[PDB]
Symmetry: D2
Subunit: 266 residues, 4 copies
């Protein structure tokens, strides 16, 4: 058994992660955090995910619960997650990171410190999206060189980053397979006269609406046909269960930067 701390436990993901750890018999919910100013600091973890009393309460700092946990699962905010990564380095803990929208500098620090700390990081903990990355590699080898490639993503009205880190990851899987760098081909907007579409651009279209848990579509378009590779997420539990399984997988592994692709054996 692996003992889990859930960072930002009152969050959309947080609540689902507590639920998911609770439902996995090889993983124990041992700690949860929230922002110091949060009105749910002191509330029982179970009462906040409709599972009843767990006998564990929300603290404002995981440093106060170091002896309770092996792995932090972090789907919060980038600054918050880097602090937790430092905490892991300091106390020989491991971390599963789901937070998206890191800057390049922040991401370099993660790559650096993952030499010291066991880390799983991914923009998507669903099986389906990790399969999709693989499908996109095959599709890009066969159609990429002559087709227009467009990435369409839809999320709920509270998502702050655009496009999704998953959309960016799909972009990267396609460009990588074609021997290109995404930044060389990405277009993130179109307004007014754009002129004609270049042949090699990867267009990103971003939808923000309602309670959409997440839709991603990669389109490979020729004159006369197109292949669309689509993933639809209908429940956050699809991410939470994956994250918990990543945590379990991660336990007692040595330092390294691991992806959900590694975890799943893809």
């Amino acid at each position: 058994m692996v003992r889990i701390a859930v960072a930002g436990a009152a969050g959309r993901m947080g609540r689902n992660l507590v639920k998911a750890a609770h439902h996995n018999p090889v993983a124990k919910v041992a700690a949860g955090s929230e922002r110091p100013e949060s009105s749910l600091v002191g509330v029982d973890l179970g009462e906040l995910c409709g599972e009843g009393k767990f006998d564990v309460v929300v603290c404002d700092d995981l440093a106060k619960q170091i002896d309770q946990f092996d792995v932090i699962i972090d789907f919060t905010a980038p600054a918050s997650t880097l602090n937790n990564l430092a905490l892991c380095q300091q106390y020989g803990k491991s971390i599963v990171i789901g937070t998206t929208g890191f800057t390049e500098e922040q991401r370099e620090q993660i790559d650096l410190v993952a030499q010291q700390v066991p880390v799983v990081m991914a923009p998507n903990y669903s099986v389906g999206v990790n399969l999709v990355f693989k499908l996109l590699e095959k599709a890009a080898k066969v159609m990429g060189d002559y087709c227009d490639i467009e990435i369409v993503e839809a999320h709920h009205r509270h998502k702050v980053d655009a496009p999704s880190g998953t959309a960016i990851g799909m972009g990267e899987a396609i460009a990588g397979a074609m021997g290109n760098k995404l930044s060389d081909v990405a277009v993130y907007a179109r307004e007014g006269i754009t002129g004609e579409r270049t042949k090699d651009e990867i267009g990103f279209a971003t939808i923000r609406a309602g309670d959409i848990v997440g839709e991603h579509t990669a389109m490979f378009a020729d004159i006369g046909e197109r292949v669309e590779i689509t993933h639809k997420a209908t429940d956050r539990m699809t991410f939470a269960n994956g994250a918990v399984k990543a945590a379990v997988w991660l336990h007692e592994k040595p330092a390294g930067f691991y992806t959900m692709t590694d975890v799943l054996g893809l």
Copy 2:
């Protein structure tokens, strides 16, 4: 019978308009134009749309064919179309305009001169899209005030303007029905940290790929459900037949700014 000049007859629309006039028994293809530098100036109208020889050839200026035609059908480029509108004013001709991406000034000139010239103008000559405008009005009255409204459009790789004039028209039909001005609520891009979506913004997402003749979706999204009103165009003839029918409708009508909504009786 109404005699038709087709402006920019070698264009994607142009070719289809010739075909469509030829197939309509109450409308006669009498003239066609192309750019002075065009290598298809002098070619027979029929040989360029797979209908065989029509006995009519492409000229570089419709002023040289004034006695041949009653109505110009213009799906070309904004400067070109305004010249044709001036030609109509000068010689008592009528015009059906399908060209999109006019500036505000250009559009003001059209509104002004349509007091003198019989004009049909619309961003979409399909029946389906003109129905959709009406559906969007009803949907906005019932759901608009509490839902997130997003407009997604997809066109072929050669379209120069973004978003489509149809997407803009849908935006305008929705905002109009809610007593708002589109410019007050439209968002045409999302990149980086956007923060949370405002309640009243109308987001536009633009896809450019392959030979897509055109897909438009208006989404009204609540927490737990969404209504999507979608139009898919699969053949340019859907626009061309509408335009020709507009031309026929327009013949001998007095000066005015008429829409495809007027033409169809919606």
Copy 3:
């Protein structure tokens, strides 16, 4: 204030209906039922939807809790619902019916006993679907007479009836608006050689998969274009909230067969 009994309270809808009633301040959760053989007979209503203890428990027969409630909300199974309708007739209670897949004979008994009992019945308690019915009427009047009409629906793997009662209701709204009877035109399957599609047929395609809460699409297809009117349900609460509102509306009303359309004022 209206007091609600939730039939089949451990069900997918049931749980949501308990939660929705409990959260709505103008309605009270007073009773819940389950099948006599059910292992959750005797469990508290609140522990069934992650809301903690309500001080109300699940009985195997609502006749034993008759003084506790005014309105039954019934999303269970057709035989079960007819028994609850009889209970209403016997004890002067009202009923909101969401159960689908009644036979014609069963439905006749509902119509008949709704002369005595205040009844709301609908295949869909979402606002969105009730708007869609109205949109379908407009679309059918404009495009129905010359276009192919197809209805596509997708639901979760546990749904027992096909097509959905909503799909059937859409079919009925369209055929009604065209002066036809659905049973005259519906086609529910296509296998082997069908030949060409007839002009008048309304095709129904049924998808069963995963945890899809429900997608319905009505398609109006011409040669070259099509209009698709789509509703996507992402959370059962979209139905539960509507049902509770129906219950509140229904309280103290006289006998009659009322729809969600009546309740919403559409």
Copy 4:
């Protein structure tokens, strides 16, 4: 250089195949057929596809033009195609078959006579669909064993067979990859009470409407997420170009049953 006879040259595919062969510089259009009762017997091939006069006319029987061609490309009707296959066997010709909806017995005769005659056969001549088959194999290996698999297809109102041979081929690629037989798991209809969905079933939903050139979607659905692999055909030329390429490839090859997968090197 390979000389091509196009069976059923006035057909939807036929016309496109003539056009495609004529435009491809490594292949020649030499012969075309139509039904003996056909009013376009005697018409020039070129006037049938807007390419002007080819100096070749439509015969009612390809046996009369046997010295004109090497390869028949046959997208007609199953009985008609079997007659052309017999003609190939009799006169040492080769055949590219696109016709769909053969019975098992008919298909056995194809398999058998392909030991004598060079044959390409496939339900889809698009590159995209041939890639999709490969993607379906990967998706089935990763998600097939625990997810619901559904296949949705949409075609134009004139298609006589259901589901599409492509839909069936997708079903076969998935079942094959899972060590199952399609006929053991396929469900082609759902009406009335079906009960719950079985674990193993592959559901097929068939849409018939308008001028849809063809949409196929394979869905792999878990509780909380789904992967959809979609192909959309927008122009018949996507099939015609593939078929012509198949014909060029097939020229001078020995007897055998070859697929589009062989031709493309997938």
